[PDB]
Design a protein around this ligand. Structure first.
Ligand code: CAG
Ligand code: XY2
Ligand code: MG
Length: 166
């Protein structure tokens, strides 16, 4: 029925795959499996609407390319992931945001900012600066853990609400 094209973007190793698998398959993967591209599709219920999620798990940049453009350009909404113990992945959200806007050639793209690995202590990115980042872009912010499942439904189902509202 009603499909939602989602894309999971952000730096290498911030938990993009781990997040998606947890949502779709309901377990935590504790392994090193670099992604080229992988998609996941599951029927779920969101606020009483039966719908399909069509989800695209990307690679960290390593850089923009036409090939990467070719995969991402069909996405409807973007889950922009960083990890709260890795300041570089946080500094990188600006680039993706920007890249996503250029790929979709739009000044308003459905988006949500995700801060992953919330089970880990001694964070290097405070919730305040990140929450302030989401607000400066006018988009929501959700903290998550692929390991504990904290926030993971919130993050994804929220992006769907941003897609419904655009
Ligand atoms: C090549 C690149 O690959 P990548 O595809 O850029 O990396 P992903 O963003 O898909 O990241 P992934 O979900 O594979 O998780 C990487 C590691 O962090 C762990 N992890 C993910 N989410 C969480 C979480 O919420 N909590 C905790 N405690 N751990 C979590 C995983 O168990 C794994 O060991 C890549 C892949 C794997 C590892 C690193 C890496 N990198 O570039 O840095
Ligand atoms: C699991 C994994 O990342 N690989 C099989 C790729 C090869 N490895 C082990 C690898 C690649 C790149 C980097 N890096 O530049 O950071 C690595 N750091 O530790 N293992 C790395
Ligand atoms: Mg991955």
């Amino acid at each position: 029925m009603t499909e939602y094209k989602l894309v999971v973007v952000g730096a290498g190793g911030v938990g993009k795959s781990a997040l998606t698998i947890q949502l779709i398959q309901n377990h935590f993967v504790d392994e090193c499996d670099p992604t080229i591209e992988d998609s996941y599709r599951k029927q779920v219920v969101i606020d009483g609407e039966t719908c399909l999620l069509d989800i695209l798990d990307t690679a960290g940049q390593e850089e923009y390319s036409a090939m990467r453009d070719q995969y991402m350009r069909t996405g409807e909404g973007f889950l922009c992931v960083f990890a709260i113990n890795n300041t570089k992945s946080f500094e990188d959200i600006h680039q993706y945001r920007e890249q996503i806007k250029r790929v979709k050639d739009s000044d308003d793209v459905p988006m949500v900012l995700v801060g992953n690995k919330s089970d880990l202590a001694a964070r290097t990115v405070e919730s305040r600066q990140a929450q302030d980042l989401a607000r400066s872009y006018g988009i929501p912010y959700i903290e998550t853990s692929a390991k504990t499942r904290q926030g993971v439904e919130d993050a994804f189902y929220t992006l769907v609400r941003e897609i419904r509202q655009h």
